[model samples]
Target: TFPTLSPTQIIQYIHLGSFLNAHNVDYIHNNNISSILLVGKDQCDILRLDIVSEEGHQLYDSIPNAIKFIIRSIQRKEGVLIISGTGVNKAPAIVIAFLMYYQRLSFINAFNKVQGLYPLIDIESGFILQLKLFEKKLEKMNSE
Candidate 1:
């Protein structure tokens, strides 16, 4: 239900540092942002928090990469939740989902193959299943 990053990175990789400065992570934190999410990979990308830093050619070593790390950490928790998916934007969300698949993390989504909305549906069903399972337990307890 909320987004949060743990003790922010202690080591600021220089090239990516300016981009973080431009976005003002401290400001985002003051505003109570629980986490940062990206939704672009192609051209006309959204103004990122890493625009100021030099990420070099290792695209995987950028701020977006840092975000991926955070997302994974959160997903490992008990009540983790993700609300942004294709509805929020498409490409990057799909890519992140793919990353999970690559890592063998559990994910489900009924993607509209062409439109690529699978992550949204997958996340929806996962929550419904969790709630439904809880409701069934509650009913049995009440009956007892």
Candidate 2:
């Protein structure tokens, strides 16, 4: 229900949900937001990705790549706003992974951080499985 976030990074987060309400536009302009990640389901070709948080969705690959975009966006000092159909599943998962991968945080540590910011973050059961499975990958990342 909120349209913004911040913590543990130079680049800020703005989850501008499906509508561009007049006030939300002002917030973006006011903050000088530099990038918009439109992770709307079934999207078209426009340098975007079609990532869903459905239990049956093939998410392992998409999440990693999405984080890559996020990393580069921040590297450029661009403010990143994650635009999902709603800020529940995919959007939350990506943040957890980014924290786990980039900041060397554990899965629960990342999830709690995000949950502290966004109270309604409810990821699917299978997506939960995927994120747990993702923890080992982060161990490898931490080792390096």
Candidate 3:
């Protein structure tokens, strides 16, 4: 059973986008975990980035194992919402959320999606997604 994790569970006001990779790197360097899972914002594509180390030539060699290890974490649900963005923009969140949906993760988005602005090209609009309401709708859908 999944616990209802509140916002308090998240490390709020974190500069996760920029610092996350470094944190992961640090964790890998000091910890004995076999691998780490990375979640990204704007899109989950960035999750594959091989970070967590200052080893130059070793990166190429370690990446494959690292990736497999990360995937294993995801499959095992070791960490569900590891934010992988630079914490400087919203794109990371969007991308990560997109991937989460693709992966069939039941998540509650705390984003203001209806902000009416798509940062890709600076497009603007007058509406926001009302994420809280959308979450409610999703809950209703799931209940049915």
Q: lDDT tens string, model 1, 2-79?
A: 112211221121011112232444544453334333422132112332322112222222424544544554454311
Model 2 Cα lDDT, one tens digit per residue, 1-144: 234343112226434333233126455556555666666422211124576545654565667777777777667755566655555676677677777777777889888888887676887778777787788766676683
Rank the models by lDDT, top first: 2, 3, 1
C-alpha lDDT of all candidate models, in order? 0.31, 0.61, 0.32
Q: What is the lDDT of residue 13 in candidate 3?
A: 16
RMSD of 2: 4.7
1 versus 2: better TM-score goes to: 2
Task: Pick the winner on lDDT between candidates 2 and 3.
Answer: 2
lDDT of 3: 0.32
What TM value does model 3 have?
0.29
* Each prediction's RMSD to truth: 15.8, 4.7, 13.7
C-alpha TM-score for every candidate? 0.24, 0.74, 0.29
Residue 14 displacement in candidate 2 (angstroms): 6.0
Whole-model lDDT, candidate 2?
0.61
Give the local distance difference test score of model 1. Answer: 0.31
